[PDB]
Scaffold this active site. Structure first.
Site, PDB file in Angstrom:
ATOM      1  N   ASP A  15       0.165   8.861   7.461  1.00 31.51           N
ATOM      2  CA  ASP A  15       0.421   7.499   7.914  1.00 31.51           C
ATOM      3  C   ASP A  15       1.653   7.508   8.809  1.00 31.51           C
ATOM      4  OD1 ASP A  15      -0.530   5.671   4.875  1.00 31.51           O
ATOM      5  OD2 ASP A  15      -1.688   6.233   6.652  1.00 31.51           O
ATOM      6  N   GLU A  49      -7.412  -4.496  12.112  1.00 35.71           N
ATOM      7  CA  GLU A  49      -8.604  -3.966  11.446  1.00 35.71           C
ATOM      8  C   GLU A  49      -9.822  -4.833  11.778  1.00 35.71           C
ATOM      9  OE1 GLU A  49      -6.816  -1.673   7.449  1.00 35.71           O
ATOM     10  OE2 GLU A  49      -7.370  -3.783   7.342  1.00 35.71           O
ATOM     11  N   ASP A  61      -3.834   0.265  13.648  1.00 37.46           N
ATOM     12  CA  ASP A  61      -3.809   0.826  12.311  1.00 37.46           C
ATOM     13  C   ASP A  61      -3.821   2.310  12.675  1.00 37.46           C
ATOM     14  OD1 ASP A  61      -6.072   0.590   9.412  1.00 37.46           O
ATOM     15  OD2 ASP A  61      -4.182   1.660   9.732  1.00 37.46           O
ATOM     16  N   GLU A 112       0.365  -1.514  11.263  1.00 39.98           N
ATOM     17  CA  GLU A 112       0.166  -1.803   9.856  1.00 39.98           C
ATOM     18  C   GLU A 112       1.359  -1.272   9.074  1.00 39.98           C
ATOM     19  OE1 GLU A 112      -2.449   0.766   7.421  1.00 39.98           O
ATOM     20  OE2 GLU A 112      -3.596  -1.061   7.051  1.00 39.98           O
ATOM     21  N   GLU A 113       1.932  -0.177   9.568  1.00 38.24           N
ATOM     22  CA  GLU A 113       3.060   0.482   8.921  1.00 38.24           C
ATOM     23  C   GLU A 113       4.430  -0.123   9.207  1.00 38.24           C
ATOM     24  OE1 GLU A 113       2.309   2.720   6.626  1.00 38.24           O
ATOM     25  OE2 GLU A 113       0.245   2.285   7.232  1.00 38.24           O
ATOM     26  N   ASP A 118       0.832  -1.197   0.000  1.00 43.13           N
ATOM     27  CA  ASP A 118       0.000   0.000   0.000  1.00 43.13           C
ATOM     28  C   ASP A 118       0.871   1.253   0.000  1.00 43.13           C
ATOM     29  OD1 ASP A 118      -2.709  -1.300   0.347  1.00 43.13           O
ATOM     30  OD2 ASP A 118      -1.755  -2.003   2.190  1.00 43.13           O
ATOM     31  N   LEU A 130      -3.682   5.013  10.963  1.00 44.74           N
ATOM     32  CA  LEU A 130      -4.557   5.836  10.132  1.00 44.74           C
ATOM     33  C   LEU A 130      -5.244   4.946   9.099  1.00 44.74           C
ATOM     34  CD1 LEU A 130      -5.279   8.873   9.905  1.00 44.74           C
ATOM     35  CD2 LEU A 130      -3.648   9.019   8.051  1.00 44.74           C
ATOM     36  N   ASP A 131      -6.523   4.675   9.322  1.00 52.06           N
ATOM     37  CA  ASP A 131      -7.308   3.832   8.427  1.00 52.06           C
ATOM     38  C   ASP A 131      -8.111   4.689   7.455  1.00 52.06           C
ATOM     39  OD1 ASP A 131      -8.911   1.389   7.574  1.00 52.06           O
ATOM     40  OD2 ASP A 131     -10.503   2.596   8.485  1.00 52.06           O
TER      41      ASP A 131
END
Ligand SMILES: Nc1ncnc2c1ncn2[C@@H]1O[C@H](COP(=O)(O)O)[C@@H](O)[C@H]1O
Ligand SMILES: Nc1ncnc2c1ncn2[C@@H]1O[C@H](COP(=O)(O)O)[C@@H](O)[C@H]1O
Ligand SMILES: Nc1ncnc2c1ncn2[C@@H]1O[C@H](COP(=O)(O)O)[C@@H](O)[C@H]1O
Ligand SMILES: Nc1ncnc2c1ncn2[C@@H]1O[C@H](COP(=O)(O)O)[C@@H](O)[C@H]1O
Ligand SMILES: O=P(O)(O)OC[C@H]1O[C@](O)(CO)[C@@H](O)[C@@H]1O
Ligand SMILES: O=P(O)(O)OC[C@H]1O[C@](O)(CO)[C@@H](O)[C@@H]1O
Ligand SMILES: O=P(O)(O)OC[C@H]1O[C@](O)(CO)[C@@H](O)[C@@H]1O
Ligand SMILES: O=P(O)(O)OC[C@H]1O[C@](O)(CO)[C@@H](O)[C@@H]1O
Ligand SMILES: [Mg+2]
Ligand SMILES: [Mg+2]
Ligand SMILES: [Mg+2]
Ligand SMILES: [Mg+2]
Ligand SMILES: [Mg+2]
Ligand SMILES: [Mg+2]
Ligand SMILES: [Mg+2]
Ligand SMILES: [Mg+2]
Lengths: 326, 326, 326, 326
Positions: free
Chosen positions: C65, C271, C109, C88-89, C59, C111-112
């Site tokens: 982010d 998530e 996460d 996630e990052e 992504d 920033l979703d």
């Protein structure tokens, strides 16, 4: 980089605390932010003017006084850390319900500098935190402890920027409120006051009532015997603002006893003691002119006390005059 | 209910203006909001401290001085309403480019009260607006007009709350900045100062340099001949804060000439004249002790002038002393 | 009347906690406020656009982010409550230094809703909190626990207003951030989702890849067999926004596996599991179509999982289709 | 660097305007900031829920609807620039009092996206500005002009950040509200939409009511005849949010007429026309499927119109289907 919450957490971390003191300070912070928010827009909220009453110390109560008092009282109770509360705005000490009762006694001036509210001059909040020493049920007597017994003290200054100054055994630290994220951020660590300053702060309108010692000292600030430059004068009219300036710039702040006020004007419990504590932890001094403010054992929660504080060499010079006249 | 924008629009509406003055004031407002925002969090932005230079009037420049100056200059230029700008922070007058050139001359103190920045004491911005009288191309001479020629004047006070005080021919009005919506809201209309106050404001640290008139006046405030209660004293140290308090509470503010300063300290163009104008439009007085501040024809954009202002009866009493000694 | 801090304190109060979980949540709140502040003015801060990299789940990373990730990581470490962090990052799990090491494992996460950043559509932050079960030193394996082991989960939605939704064993509660005082305030207690809704949420652009069950279900929402009114459709494109709407309005949200994605798109750890937990604590359901999301034992911290969640009767109706086709 | 106020001033500067349009836009901005402020904390202000009434277009009114409507109406009147106002919340057109009467007719939707208020989904405000063409006294008929007669149009989106999108003859520009200083700042100049996008936006819950053309188009977006990748789907449910995404990302937004709604749902005057104008000034298209939205001469201030808008190639492809079926 460091918020007040983190600082207090890490400090209690080393203090091996149980978190009760931590909760207390965090709740006090929340109240201060709410007060600051209202203060910055008080006129628009129509918070200026009188509330419609007079306190024990004989003072016209303002709308902000009521609002700020309710905020501090409510957050202190909900903290589960206090048992006895003493407010300038309350005749008697407030005893906390068993449920939310904690082991701390908090004395505070919810909004200091009332005379400066309507003209937008800096105002603030002052607090002193004691550990319940008695074994009996919580009562007013639990707040009648000498300042030297303080575990924490400080003030919130709503000036050009809003600052929370916190003093504890380890020292004095300053946190500034960032209006954007609503967090107090550490901006000054282990603050120490200058040994000697160049500013004297006092209401000279009482010149006719001052004792010979204060009179002689002021004359010396204006006409130095060593031909040095005279001290500059500053008197905002709000104890919180004048004391904070004394802390960061050095110098001396005075609200002495006079012919009409044997015990001065400022209140020992929630005005003098906290500032005396902050001042001493910063390497400064706080005296009545004859004795250390922090060593006074109070007999009345609303009793007054004369107070002379600031840079050690300045305060000491004034003390030498009192002794010379004694 | 009434924002500063609406007030200024409706006022220019009746003044039959072309909107240029309106644009000027609106731009000035934007700069003031930005300044206020930075001021309330200056320590966090690391805006405290010196910038690294000294102005013509010999003063250590601070970071906020630079920032606030750049903000005012830029918004004034973009307003399309000015031709000549005079700033305390600039050696010479700033001439506006033909493109964005307007018919107004603006003199301002981007940030007043520098000595009080680091200690969080109230500070502000002062401005005076003149209409270009000359026919020649815009130059410094266009700012060398007597205060009586002012078309608009006022100040922004960054105190407990942020206030914009605006004086024009019709009177003085106070607007408070609502931080939430970023709009100045009218909170005090057609303000008038009390005929006589009970507070005197002056730096008594200069006692050894004061002339006999100021000396006699202060002695009278402390020991009234009619045995009335002595006046209270207040001196925040920021002209904007002391003058605003004088405006709303009444009394007198003084920064007189002395043995070492024939023309006092405060600057005529962007400090004395604006406050003198606000004061006179509010029914107050502003004098050097010998002549009306507004009647002085300046010969230097950075020239100083002594200033005594406030309630008419107080200022007049001081004037009678100067005349008695003259 | 009730801030998030007070709620969490009183809740841990009854839980007889030691305060570590309390600290964790408070730190998480601070990060969320900072994120919200930046988000509301991201374009002005130039926080839009790509950062210049791609994560494990393939992504394109944005500036927000990175910023949001750094904020969450730093506050979680300083909390002294965590030992293992999964973002996630971040390719691998982050192991917390012994000093600031706590007993909690946090998957999040930061920033979703990345696809909706530049167009100003609602975005958010998602988190799941686990208690370290292993006895070995902290490692990635400690984050490989089934959702059913969650001790706390929720999300921050930066929509028309900023909301923090927190789910724990006792239930789901919603707190709204008051930008003025910077405090989250309780606005919805013990939230429960409707048994049956009237909105279905799915990206129908994948129609060509959907399995027969999802295909049949959508057709039924548009052409009800009982001749009832068809369900309305909503798909914001940000999981946090679509799930929150599902929570408060009822209905169903779907991101099923398809011909090209056996395990769907959304990530199980940070998530699916958190939303599945919130949903189940609110009386809702969360399934892959064949098994309960919370019962999945992960083998990869970045593994994906199909997810169907919302009102029990809607989710159950879809489950009956999968079973009918099975 | 450039505030909305400066932009509008400099633009009217070149337009050789008299400042009336400028005042109008500035007043509209103030209302938008106040709305944004309330929206970001609506739940805390208890602004969620119904007001207790239904409009002409048969819709349950919310508290925010009333508040936002009162704000826009009041600022428009005080602007001295309007004569006739048309609001979604008002049965008949509002005629401005002679005193504050101007030459502009403003049609607006004070708060768009009511169905998304309680779930915190993006909502907004939509406006269209016309120049009074009639010579008679101001009346409702003055608002019955075709969109092509628009002098200005745009919307405020209260999404992750608050944006004001303004379209005029010269083009479309986007300004983001900086909550700190309360000023809209230019962040996107002369915006142009992509010729062809990859997202289709429509409520597919009406599938059973769609005409064959819309039906065929959707099927083509899911199963492209050229075997290209299918379009992604997005439908926030708030016209302002879906249109803004269409503007910045490209694609198509649709709210077509159907078997039960010959004229669709969205209102021509204050919803369709403004977005049609913004879209056309950005190089996009806006059609009912049979005719240009902007060319419709309204006969009712609250009349509805079908609307298909977005990237030219997408809208044109849909138009070719309608023509093929015609
Ligand atoms: N956050 C803190 N910072 C400094 N000292 C603390 C802190 N928390 C607790 N202490 C010290 O530990 C004592 C007991 O704390 P507690 O168990 O929380 O009541 C207090 O009276 C302080 O002397
Ligand atoms: N907003 C206003 N409020 C008060 N007086 C104004 C205003 N605008 C203009 N005036 C007066 O009208 C004169 C000409 O205005 P202008 O044409 O805008 O330069 C000014 O010098 C003022 O005396
Ligand atoms: N604030 C809280 N709210 C709810 N449950 C809590 C809270 N604090 C602690 N707990 C519960 O108590 C356990 C131990 O807390 P702690 O000793 O702080 O790690 C947690 O895993 C939760 O199950
Ligand atoms: N700020 C502005 N930006 C763009 N066009 C403007 C502006 N002000 C005025 N105009 C144009 O000039 C016309 C007359 O303006 P006014 O005299 O202010 O009513 C308007 O109808 C617009 O076409
Ligand atoms: O007007 P006075 O007598 O100088 O009193 C000023 C003092 O009074 C207080 O307002 C307390 O009442 C202090 O904040 C301040 O130091
Ligand atoms: O310290 P002093 O000499 O009293 O000067 C104070 C004055 O100086 C100023 O800071 C201007 O330099 C004014 O704001 C204030 O009135
Ligand atoms: O564009 P798609 O495939 O519908 O993906 C949308 C989903 O992706 C996410 O952005 C995660 O990447 C979720 O927030 C959202 O539910
Ligand atoms: O729920 P529906 O029928 O898709 O309506 C959604 C549309 O209705 C509106 O809320 C107007 O009522 C628009 O903002 C939005 O585009
Ligand atoms: Mg006090
Ligand atoms: Mg008080
Ligand atoms: Mg100055
Ligand atoms: Mg200055
Ligand atoms: Mg995500
Ligand atoms: Mg993400
Ligand atoms: Mg609408
Ligand atoms: Mg509406």
């Amino acid at each position: 980089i460091v918020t007040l919450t983190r600082f207090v957490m890490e400090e209690g971390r080393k203090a091996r605390g149980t978190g009760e003191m931590t909760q207390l300070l965090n709740s006090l912070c929340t109240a201060v932010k709410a007060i600051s928010t209202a203060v910055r827009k008080a006129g628009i909220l129509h918070l200026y003017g009188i509330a419609g009453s007079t306190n024990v110390t004989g003072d016209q109560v303002k709308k902000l006084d009521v609002l700020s008092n309710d905020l501090v009282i409510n957050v202190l109770k909900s903290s589960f850390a206090t048992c006895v509360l003493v407010s300038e705005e309350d005749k008697n000490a407030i005893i906390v319900e068993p449920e939310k009762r904690g082991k701390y006694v908090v004395c505070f001036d919810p909004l200091d500098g009332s005379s400066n509210i309507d003209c937008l001059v800096s105002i603030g909040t002052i607090f002193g935190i004691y550990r319940k020493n008695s074994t009996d049920e919580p009562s007013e007597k639990d707040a009648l402890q000498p300042g030297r017994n303080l575990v924490a003290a400080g003030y919130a200054l709503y000036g050009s920027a809003t600052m929370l100054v916190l003093a504890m055994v380890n020292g004095v630290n300053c946190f500034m409120l960032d209006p954007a994220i609503g967090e107090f951020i550490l901006v000054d660590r282990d603050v120490k006051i200058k040994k000697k300053g160049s500013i004297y702060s006092i209401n000279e309108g009482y010149a006719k009532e001052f004792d010979p010692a204060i009179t002689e000292y002021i004359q010396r600030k204006k006409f130095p015997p060593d031909n040095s430059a005279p001290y500059g004068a500053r008197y905002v009219g709000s104890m919180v603002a004048d004391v904070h300036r004394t802390l960061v710039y050095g110098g001396i702040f005075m609200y002495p006893a006079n012919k009409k006020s044997p015990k001065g004007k400022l209140r020992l419990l929630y005005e003098c003691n906290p500032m005396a504590y902050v001042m001493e932890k910063a390497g400064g001094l706080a005296t009545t002119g004859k004795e250390a403010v922090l060593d006074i054992v109070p007999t009345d929660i609303h009793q007054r006390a004369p107070i002379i504080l600031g840079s050690p060499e300045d305060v000491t010079e004034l003390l030498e005059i009192y002794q010379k006249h004694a």
